[PDB]
Design an enzyme around this catalytic site. Sequence first.
Site, PDB file in Angstrom:
ATOM      1  CD  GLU A  35     -15.546 -16.202 -35.185  1.00 36.61           C
ATOM      2  OE1 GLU A  35     -15.742 -17.407 -35.494  1.00 36.61           O
ATOM      3  OE2 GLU A  35     -14.364 -15.640 -35.522  1.00 36.61           O
TER       4      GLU A  35
ATOM      5  CE  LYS B 200     -11.904 -14.179 -33.909  1.00 35.48           C
ATOM      6  NZ  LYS B 200     -11.650 -15.502 -32.990  1.00 35.48           N
TER       7      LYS B 200
ATOM      8  CE  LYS C 138      -6.662 -14.139 -33.516  1.00 33.35           C
ATOM      9  NZ  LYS C 138      -6.392 -15.599 -33.399  1.00 33.35           N
ATOM     10  CB  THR C 139      -3.168 -18.734 -34.976  1.00 29.18           C
ATOM     11  OG1 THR C 139      -3.965 -18.727 -33.978  1.00 29.18           O
ATOM     12  CG2 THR C 139      -1.687 -18.863 -35.103  1.00 29.18           C
ATOM     13  N   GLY C 140      -5.460 -18.812 -36.897  1.00 30.47           N
ATOM     14  CA  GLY C 140      -6.795 -19.125 -37.314  1.00 30.47           C
ATOM     15  C   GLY C 140      -6.839 -20.668 -37.678  1.00 30.47           C
TER      16      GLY C 140
ATOM     17  CB  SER D 297      -9.172 -16.542 -35.447  1.00 29.63           C
ATOM     18  OG  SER D 297     -10.476 -16.898 -34.829  1.00 29.63           O
TER      19      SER D 297
END
Lengths: 265, 165
Positions: A141, A48, A209-211, A45
């Site tokens: 996704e 994004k 922002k993480t993933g 992610s």
Amino acid sequence: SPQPLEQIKLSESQLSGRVGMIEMDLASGRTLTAWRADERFPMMSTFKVVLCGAVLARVDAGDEQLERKIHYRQQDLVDYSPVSEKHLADGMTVGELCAAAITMSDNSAANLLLATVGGPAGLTAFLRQIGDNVTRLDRWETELNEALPGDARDTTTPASMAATLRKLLTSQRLSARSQRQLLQWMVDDRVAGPLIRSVLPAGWFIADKTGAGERGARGIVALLGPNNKAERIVVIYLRDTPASMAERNQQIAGIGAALIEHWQR
Amino acid sequence: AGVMTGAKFTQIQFGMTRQQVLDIAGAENCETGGSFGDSIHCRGHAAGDYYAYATFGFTSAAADAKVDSKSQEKLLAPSAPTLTLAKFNQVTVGMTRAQVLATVGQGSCTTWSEYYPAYPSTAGVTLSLSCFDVDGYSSTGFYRGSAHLWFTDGVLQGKRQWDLV
């Protein structure tokens, strides 16, 4: 206690995994600390931020409006879509979709936005346009999180991601208003608690922002600094580990904690 | 107490008020407003880059409004998942729910969302199912063999699959 690179070597040994990290000065773009900086990692992610950068570039050009309402259908819904599933009947604006994609990792939101920029190929073309010749998005996704070993699809490198984030957030490429909006969405991230936020000292700025992916993949991209002002970009990716989610989070938080403890050393 | 769970999801019913929903879910697990409008959204355990969760929708913003929509991810496991690519290929748009389940396996699916837009009438009821092959479901990460099947008035409108056989 350990220095950042010492902590990384401990983490790789404990996880049997591979960590990629860059710490970059935000103003100058100088690389301050690096590890596996030229190896590829699944973005998950974290892509994004780039996606909504591309959306804002269209806004700046008069080709998109954050207020534009997008209507969608069941066919558009994939897993991990708490906000977009709620708004199925009424639709969402472009700006609402970027808020959901960034702050909640809403996957269907990201797909709807991806369509507006020409899909994964369109987003990759945007990256090339801004001078990132490494990062690539290939799938939608939720397939892009597959993290098959050695797969170049949907990957970045810590060096390329750090440079790209600096470009999107501080260079002349996006308007002042767009840079503030992209940073605000990152400030308002809701799903990053267990990572750098868990070790961030009182009074510091953070935007992130993480993933998360398969096969142990996990990552964070962040701007942080003391005195409630962003000072550095930190990118941390993990791949190829069988460790639990709790362990993966704890290790990334520990690498962040080492960077913080040794901020001026 | 605990976080949102499958058991709480099952105890929450269509026709409940907001306060009834909160009392079962545990208010500390739930939120409304902002991104969720007048719905109530309740978090379970961490999963992937979000959480397992439920979202409950209501007939209106009024205090006495009733649950007309239940949605969840990763709160419910399929009871006996037996879906395959071949079975998925046998499913056709226009099938009833019973025909679909007979095709994909009776224990293969969980309910992603169910909404009664004309509550208390069933007219226009929408149903979204997630169905899984033998090892496809996960409550904490990513699926490895799944399908999305959706219905209006009990008749299949569309289907999609990922990773089957």
